[PDB]
Amino acid sequence: MDTSNHLLPGLFRQLGLEDEPAAIRAFIDSHPLPPRVPLPEAPFWTPAQAAFLRQALECDAEWSEAADGLAVLLQQGEA
Predict the structure, then answer these.
(1) What is the CATH number of domain 1-79?
(2) What residue segments make up the domains of the chain, in order of their start?
(3) Could you give the angle at which helices 64-75 and 7-15 cross, rounded to 10 degrees?
(4) What is the DSSP secondary-structure string of 15-76?
(5) H-run or E-run covering 8
(6) What's the number of CA atoms in the CB half-sphere (13 Å) around residue 35?
(7) First to last CA, the chain
(8) How many CB atoms lie within 10 A of CB 27?
């Protein structure tokens, strides 16, 4: 439930971003989410990729720790 999740590299390549954990933490820092708005409800992601993320939030998938472990970072970001 963190940036050090090796699922984030693969999840970002899936969404069309870098697998570099240094770049990954920089993307989510530069573009955070409000604690009311979760990962599949983010207008930052494209509608097909957001509905694809949503599947892991609808039912516990193999991308469960990817999507959950990312969603915590966005909603519990910076100022």
Answers:
(1) 1.10.10.1130
(2) 1-79
(3) 80
(4) HTS---HHHHHHHHHHS---TTS-STT-TTS-HHHHHHHHHHHHS--TTHHHHHHHHHHHHT
(5) helix 7-15
(6) 4
(7) 20
(8) 16
Taking residue 74's Cβ as centre, other Cβ atoms within 10 Å add up to: 20
| Residue whose token pair is 């599949």 | 40
Q: What are phi and psi of 39, to 5 degrees?
A: -60, -50
Q: Residue 8 has which token pair?
A: 């984030």
Retrieve residue 50's tokens. Answer: 């957001």
What method did the depositors use to determine the structure? NMR
Q: Which helix (H) or strand (E) holds 5?
A: none
Quick one: tokens of 48? 């097909």
Tokens 């984030």 map to which residue?
8
